[PDB]
Design a protein around this ligand. Structure first.
Ligand SMILES: [Zn+2]
Lengths: 195, 150, 359, 468, 256
């Protein structure tokens, strides 16, 4: 088994990017977004591409949508009417929590050590999608040695979207070009449902 | 573990004049708790189940509109039968909804007395146990749509 | 020195029904956990506007209408001596943005408050513009340059300077828009209230068997907290640069009414003509509402009034000590209090204290 | 630059997250598994189309067994070279009188920025895809400019595999299937538009069109005013050393009579008692692509046929499930991928039943909110109460985008109506939510109360009828 | 010592309507299972920027920019949520037309609620220092105190002139940490009213902090100024009797 770094993405509101009148969310974090989160934790500035590209060539993700109890509470979504003195509608996610397995690709330069130090003492304010969205639980360190490391870190049974194969796929415009600053490519999530 | 609405209905019909009258005098629903004949009437029907008694209170109080204003026959809604009476004006019903808790049960009883309605009792009983913003809303909707059918 | 003047009032009404909604229910309101009887900021404001007190010490209220046909009729009557008829009309159409021909019915976008003096001043400007062969749009630029003149006309109708105006269609949209110096909050009962229902009958002198009508009405007695703050600079601006003392004069008048005036309904049948039992006025840099003194719904001891006032003082002391506030403060009460708030034995004295800006 | 020899194709390893520009030989011969990395969905689909067409004229499979084999093993380089020679001559993006999908000496005033081609500065690969897009999929400026052959918002439907090459190869017909789909072979010519032009105002038998000529059909007088950089592409992302900005338009008109048999889009036929008229599938509606899947996977013959590519697949591996790309235009891009489990070919009736479920719900929700909105209107209420069914239905459709695919991907076609009834549930709950959610901010108003009652009644009457 | 400074505020507003959407309904949000009234981060942030306090103490030109960004900000402000579930009240208003005797000229509705809100805001200290060009931690800390003051004192303007919820904060807690964090989960299980919402809201906040803060990371200097008497969280959080003292404590970086 290779090394995994586990994370907790959970806040009363979150918002994960999707193409546009309104600015809507998906139901889980995006890759562009998770990159955002991570680069943020590290000393990363938008202009300095080479380092961002190194990050993106270095890391891979698996995300678990897993839900509230009380009796359970399935995730709901709100529509924020957000104005500028120009009108926008901005979708946010209510009662979202995610567990995230993060592993290193056969490419360098990061080692999971660098990344947990980064997650622990972030250089940049971290936020679930928009800075409007603080998070309730710090990105806790995982250490554990597929989906199996997630089976370790409770709460179980929420199903996982992931870049390892196990098969259904779910196609998304998550993957950011870094050469065209704010655009994206066509990536595919592998889907592992339930248990 | 619900309340046998029909058995209770029949039980109220079977009461002695002394008790039909003893319960009818009651002004607010809680005063029923001062009546022994109340406890006697209700106890088999699951009184002594805390989470049951508020419901039981309402059902009995509405029956307590007396003497037999509530007459039983997909089912017939309370809203529907209240309209089918034709005695009751929409505004009054709105007021039933707009009034706070105990007041709303009182006001309803007044309505029932005036309407002398033909409902489906166990239905009305269900609605009456779960009595809540939703149930109220439904009372409105059934009333207006029925009163409008006519 | 201090810009905001805060007014806190505790008034106890007898059984009454002082604010109904469309279904003739009292106005419910929930705080923090419990129902409280509510009287609207609007009803209070209009109670003061239309009042004899106001009439006597502040002046004429504004004329708030949406019917421009009737408005031009009145304007034609009053201002007709002072200006040409055509001029009055054009002025009204320019301010309105709607056309004033001779039709029986003509309407603005929405209800608007008008000041006759204001319209008069505009008629004079419109007259100079017509004689000077000024273009209307040019007239707009010129009048737009100096707003204050229009605000001095606002000085004839103070309720507008206190409570504000908005327009969407007229020349007014650009010219006559006012914030309103005074913020007022809806009265709440300090304590929980379950409203009573009175069951009435109407007896018909011509039918002997039974009543001709049967009905119900909600009503409650309640101890209400009235709150309002007057922003003073805003008041001065809205009058076109009136003095601080003139503003303060307006403030004392407002204090007086907030303490003494009760809405009219259904007073003729329930008659809660009750004066305030506690009136507290403090100067500050930031407006402050003591409503939180009563988020914990007051529980009755010897009535609600006494524990409400006790609750009020305890919270005031606590807030003031926490946020280290040192603004001028005076309190007038009818009943049995914490220090460093000056005690006024009479309302008139509390008022003089406001006029003199904290002794 | 030449499409067959040099490298254009914007590309990314599936897992490998590094952008690269590769050449046809490389794509056809590496066990590498590539996906294309393009910033636009239309652009991606176009690139795919072009690559498919190319693969279709350079190397149709001799039999189904060879189809299989070639899907499973890349070609040796020599094999590819051999397959690719004649065509080499045809596929240059600069030439004397034969530039790829262009026409020489186009005259106009002034230039059109590369931008308008897409519907900036571009590399050879980026341009060639753009070109192919405007000539195949986009509406097309004129205005005295013909488009086709399909034409002007046609819906492309491709079969997807593992890898890029797996996909390309997968959507290329076996030679017998090919000469079956295009019989007559008395057709002047098979030579492409830019080799042996059409001339206004030609009148054309669809049957005179060779499959080469028609796959690469260009209906436009387009000339690429010569390249500048030395620098970086606006689609590709990377540096290109040769970039186009200039582009020359010219009006032109002809008429192809009757329907050409394009292999990439579902023919759908309609017969008025007057006239037997058939056209390719158009994204005419604002619906989620799933509504249309009855016409993309199920054959009916009024009625419809599916892309010869799809039907071929359905024949070739009957036991395999189906990954399907759907793309097109309204302007508004649309691009979705859809999976059907091992049953699909066999049971279309099940598929139809599901589409019908979706639609039936949408209908009930709409009928409800509409009667509310019409009531709203009648009482003269100011505001969006009039458009409630619109707004609402929009939300529904987004939700249904998420819902229906899941179902189809996972159904057990042989056994399962339980999962169908479960979807019936999910949808039921959905319509309830949406009714309440969009009628809510009005509902507290006394006057409206009557029309609300009706409304709700309606929502539930219909909703009962939706269930057996 | 620690890089992020967390600011927690609990405030009770009287019946009011501090944020509307397209349709003039107040702004809701669902948490964790129940409806709560919301104030947008935007409304608060603007309330603070446009505030006179801010104008005076942040306007002093490049400091407000370093703090809040062009009009990229060092301080984050979160949508406020109510601690408890809320069903909005509706006020039905009448406009009385001075020229028509027989009726109202306009009839309408407005949504309104009283509510106990949790405002959360986090200031990145490294970010602020860099955005100022390397100002001292103490230099940063001054600005941070200003933020605390506003977060505790400033309320959005609407529709204050008619509903007037000019309420001061009842609870302010400030904690230093390595990773900025929100105590909103204290109220995920929506607080139930016991003798008001405010007090039990503060109980929830405190109990949560005890549990979680020693359970999670992190443990950095923390101080709380509160107006109400509830059994205060374990004395790893220093207690400030006045807001100004809390501010001075922030200035001195959690002195001890
Ligand atoms: Zn390129």
């Amino acid at each position: 088994m290779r090394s995994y770094l586990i994370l907790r993405l959970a806040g009363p509101m979150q918002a994960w990017g999707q193409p546009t009148g309104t600015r809507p969310t998906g139901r889980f974090p995006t890759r562009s977004g998770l990159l955002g989160l991570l680069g943020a934790c590290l000393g990363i500035q938008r202009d300095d591409t080479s380092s961002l590209q190194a990050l993106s060539e270095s890391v891979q993700f698996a995300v678990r949508c897993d839900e509230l109890i009380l009796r359970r509470v399935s995730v709901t979504g709100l529509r924020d009417y957000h104005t500028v003195l120009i009108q926008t509608w901005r979708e946010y996610l209510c009662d979202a929590s995610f567990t995230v397995a993060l592993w290193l690709t056969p490419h360098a330069t990061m080692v999971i050590s660098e990344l947990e130090k980064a997650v622990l003492k972030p250089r940049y304010t971290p936020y679930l999608g928009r800075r409007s969205c603080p998070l309730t639980h710090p990105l806790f360190l995982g250490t554990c040695q597929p989906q199996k490391a997630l089976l370790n870190y409770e709460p179980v049974g929420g199903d996982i979207y992931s870049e390892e194969s196990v098969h259904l796929k779910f196609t998304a415009r998550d993957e950011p070009m870094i050469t065209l600053p704010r655009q994206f490519a066509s990536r595919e999530w592998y889907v592992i449902k339930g248990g | 573990d619900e309340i046998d609405a029909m058995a209770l209905y029949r039980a109220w019909q079977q009461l002695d004049n002394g008790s039909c009258a003893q319960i009818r005098r009651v002004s607010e629903p809680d005063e029923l708790r001062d009546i022994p004949a109340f406890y006697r009437l209700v106890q088999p029907f699951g009184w002594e189940n805390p989470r049951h008694q508020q419901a039981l209170l309402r059902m009995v109080f509405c029956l307590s509109a007396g003497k037999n204003v509530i007459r039983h026959q997909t089912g017939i809604s309370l809203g529907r039968a209240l309209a089918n009476s034709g005695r009751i004006n929409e505004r009054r019903i709105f007021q039933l909804i707009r009034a706070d808790r105990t007041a709303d049960m009182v006001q309803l009883r007044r309505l029932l007395t005036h309407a002398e309605p033909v409902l489906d009792w166990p239905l009305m009983a269900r609605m009456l146990t779960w009595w809540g913003k939703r149930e109220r809303q439904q009372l409105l909707e059934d009333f207006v749509l029925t009163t409008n059918k006519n | 020195m201090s810009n905001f003047i805060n007014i806190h009032v505790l008034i106890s009404h007898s059984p009454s029904c002082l604010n109904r909604d469309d279904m003739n229910m009292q106005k419910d309101a929930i705080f923090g956990g419990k129902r409280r009887v509510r009287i609207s900021s609007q009803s209070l404001k209009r109670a003061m506007r239309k009042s004899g007190y106001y009439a006597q010490n502040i002046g004429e209220s504004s004329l708030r209408t949406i019917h421009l046909a009737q408005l031009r009729d009145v304007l034609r009557q009053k201002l007709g001596e002072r200006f040409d008829q055509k001029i009055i009309d054009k002025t009204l159409a320019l301010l309105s943005g709607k056309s004033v021909d001779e039709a029986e019915k003509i309407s603005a976008d929405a209800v608007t408050p008008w000041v006759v003096g204001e319209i008069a001043w505009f008629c004079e400007q419109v007259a100079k513009a017509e004689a000077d062969n000024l273009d209307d749009k040019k007239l707009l630029k010129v009048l737009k340059e100096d707003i204050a003149a229009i605000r001095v006309n606002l000085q004839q109708g103070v309720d507008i300077a206190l409570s504000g105006r908005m327009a969407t269609s007229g020349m007014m949209t650009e010219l006559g828009k006012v914030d309103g110096a005074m913020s007022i909050a809806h009265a709440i009962t300090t304590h929980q209230v379950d409203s009573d229902i009175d069951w009435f009958t109407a007896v018909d002198d011509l039918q002997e068997q039974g009543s001709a009508h049967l009905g119900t009405q909600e009503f409650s007695s309640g101890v209400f907290y009235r709150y309002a703050n007057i922003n003073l600079a805003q008041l001065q601006e809205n009058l076109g640069g009136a003095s601080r003392e003139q503003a303060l004069e307006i403030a004392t008048h407002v204090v007086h009414m907030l303490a003494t005036e009760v809405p009219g309904a259904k007073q003729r049948t329930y008659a809660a003509f009750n004066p305030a039992d506690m009136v507290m006025v403090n100067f500050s840099d930031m407006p402050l509402s003591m409503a939180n003194a009563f988020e914990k719904a007051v529980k009755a001891k010897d009535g609600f009034l006494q524990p409400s006032i006790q609750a009020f003082n305890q919270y005031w002391d606590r807030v003031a000590n926490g946020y280290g506030l040192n603004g001028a403060a005076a309190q007038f009460s009818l009943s049995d209090i914490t220090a460093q708030v000056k005690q006024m034995p009479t309302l008139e004295q509390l008022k003089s204290w406001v006029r003199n800006n904290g002794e | 630059m030449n499409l067959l020899i040099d490298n254009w194709i914007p590309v990314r390893p599936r897992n490998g997250g590094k952008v690269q520009i590769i050449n046809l030989q490389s794509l056809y011969c590496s066990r590498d598994q590539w996906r294309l990395s393009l910033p636009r969905d239309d652009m991606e689909l176009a690139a795919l189309a072009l690559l498919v067409c190319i693969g279709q004229i350079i190397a149709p499979a001799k039999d189904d067994v060879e189809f299989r084999h070639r899907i499973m093993n890349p070609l040796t380089e020599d094999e590819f070279q051999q397959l690719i020679a004649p065509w080499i001559d045809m596929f240059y993006l600069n030439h004397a009188e034969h530039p790829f999908m262009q026409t020489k000496g186009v005259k106009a005033n002034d230039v059109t920025p590369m931008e308008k081609l897409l519907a900036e500065a571009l590399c050879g690969g980026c341009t060639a895809i753009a070109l192919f897009n405007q000539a195949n999929q986009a509406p097309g400026f004129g205005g005295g400019f013909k488009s086709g052959l399909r034409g002007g918002t046609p819906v492309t439907t491709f079969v997807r595999g593992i890898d890029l090459r797996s996909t390309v190869l997968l959507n290329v017909l076996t030679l017998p299937r090919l000469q079956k789909q295009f019989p007559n072979e008395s057709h002047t010519e098979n030579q492409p538009t830019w080799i042996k032009p059409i001339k206004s105002n030609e009148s054309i038998p669809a049957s005179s069109i060779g499959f080469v000529r028609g796959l690469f059909w260009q209906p436009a007088h387009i000339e690429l005013c010569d390249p500048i950089g030395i620098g970086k592409c606006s689609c590709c992302g990377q540096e290109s050393n040769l970039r186009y900005t200039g582009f020359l338009k010219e009006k032109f008109t002809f008429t192809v009579n009757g329907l050409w048999p394009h292999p990439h889009s579902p023919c759908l036929v309609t017969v008025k008692k007057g006239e037997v008229e058939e056209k390719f599938l158009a994204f005419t509606t604002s619906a989620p692509s799933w509504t249309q899947i009855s016409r993309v996977v199920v054959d009916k013959i009024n009625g419809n046929r599916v892309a010869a590519v799809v039907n071929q697949f359905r024949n070739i591996a009957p036991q395999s499930p189906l990954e399907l790309i759907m793309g097109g235009y309204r302007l508004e891009r649309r691009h979705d991928v859809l999976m059907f489990n091992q049953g699909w070919q066999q049971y279309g009736n099940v598929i139809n039943e599901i589409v019908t479920v979706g639609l039936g719900y949408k209908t009930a929700l709409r009928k409800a909110l509409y009667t509310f909105a019409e009531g709203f209107k009648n009482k003269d209420f100011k505001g969006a109460g009039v458009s409630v069914h619109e707004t609402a239905e929009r939300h529904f459709y987004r939700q249904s985008e998420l819902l229906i695919p899941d179902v189809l991907a996972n159904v057990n076609f042989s056994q399962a109506d339980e999962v169908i009834a479960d979807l019936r549930d999910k949808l039921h709950q959905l319509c309830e939510m949406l009714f309440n959610q969009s009628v809510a901010p009005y509902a507290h108003h006394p006057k409206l109360i009557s029309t609300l009652a009706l409304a709700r009644a309606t929502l539930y009457k219909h909703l009962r009828e939706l269930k057996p």
